[PDB]
Structure formats: C-alpha cells, structure tokens
C-alpha cells in the first residue's frame, strides 16, 4: 500500500478581485429645465 | 497553498447574459 501524504489532491479557489472592483455607473443628462425660465418658440400672429 | 496563472486565451473570455426585467 502507498500513502497519499505527498501526492494528496489539490483544491482550487480563485483570488477574486471583486473587493477592489470598480462599480457600474449610470449616466443622467442634466436637462435644461423648463421649470427654470427656458426659452419658448415664438409662434407669431399678424394684426392686419 | 500555491498560486497558478490561467492560460485561458482571450477569445475564450467572452460571455453573454440573458435575463428578465424582474
């Protein structure tokens, strides 16, 4: 008989870098609000 | 233990994900 002492099997486990991983970022455009005095289209009429 | 470096070629590093909105 032989003993597995020296030849024992190996388990594996990755060295995950999640602890130092950057996050996913969401973008939102800062709308030029119409609540603030934004301009409007100058629909014109004629006084005949 | 000891450390090992994977030889996984770059072309095999692509992954596709399918899911639901929930």
UniProtKB/Swiss-Prot annotation, chain A:
Tissue: Widely expressed.
Post-translational modification: Glycosylated.
Quaternary structure and interacting proteins, as annotated: Forms heterodimers with IL17RC; the heterodimer binds IL17A and IL17F homodimers as well as the heterodimer formed by IL17A and IL17F. Forms complexes with 2:1 binding stoichiometry: two receptor chains for one interleukin molecule. IL17A homodimer preferentially drives the formation of IL17RA-IL17RC heterodimeric receptor complex, whereas IL17F homodimer forms predominantly complexes with IL17RC homodimer. (Microbial infection) Interacts with SARS coronavirus-2/SARS-CoV-2 virus protein ORF8.
UniProt disease link: Immunodeficiency 51: A primary immunodeficiency disorder with altered immune responses and impaired clearance of fungal infections, selective against Candida. It is characterized by persistent and/or recurrent infections of the skin, nails and mucous membranes caused by organisms of the genus Candida, mainly Candida albicans.
Stated role: Receptor for IL17A and IL17F, major effector cytokines of innate and adaptive immune system involved in antimicrobial host defense and maintenance of tissue integrity. Receptor for IL17A. Receptor for IL17F. Binds to IL17A with higher affinity than to IL17F. Binds IL17A and IL17F homodimers as part of a heterodimeric complex with IL17RC. Also binds heterodimers formed by IL17A and IL17F as part of a heterodimeric complex with IL17RC.
Protein name from the UniProt record: Interleukin-17 receptor A
Native species: Homo sapiens
Taxonomic lineage: Eukaryota, Metazoa, Chordata, Craniata, Vertebrata
Entire protein: shown range: 624 to 671 of 866
Curated annotation (Swiss-Prot), chain B:
Disease: Psoriasis 13: A common, chronic inflammatory disease of the skin with multifactorial etiology. It is characterized by red, scaly plaques usually found on the scalp, elbows and knees. These lesions are caused by abnormal keratinocyte proliferation and infiltration of inflammatory cells into the dermis and epidermis.
Task performed by this protein: E3 ubiquitin ligase that catalyzes 'Lys-63'-linked polyubiquitination of target protein, enhancing protein-protein interaction and cell signaling. Transfers ubiquitin from E2 ubiquitin-conjugating enzyme UBE2V1-UBE2N to substrate protein. Essential adapter molecule in IL17A-mediated signaling. Upon IL17A stimulation, interacts with IL17RA and IL17RC receptor chains through SEFIR domains and catalyzes 'Lys-63'-linked polyubiquitination of TRAF6, leading to TRAF6-mediated activation of NF-kappa-B and MAPkinase pathways.
Full protein: residues contained: 398 to 419 of 574
Subunit details: Interacts with IKBKG/NF-kappa B essential modulator, with CHUK/IKK-alpha and with IKBKB/IKK-beta. Interacts with TRAF6; this interaction is direct. Interacts with IL17RA and IL17RC. Interacts with IL17RB.
Organism: Homo sapiens (Human)
Tissue: Widely expressed.
The protein, known as: E3 ubiquitin ligase TRAF3IP2
């Amino acid at each position: 008989v032989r003993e597995p002492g020296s030849q024992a099997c190996l388990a594996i486990d990755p060295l995950v870098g999640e602890e130092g991983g950057a996050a996913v970022a969401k973008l939102e455009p800062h709308l030029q609000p119409r609540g603030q005095p934004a301009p409007q289209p100058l629909h014109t009429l004629v006084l005949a | 233990g000891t450390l090992k470096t994977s030889n996984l070629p770059e072309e095999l590093r692509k992954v596709f994900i399918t899911y639901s909105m929930d």
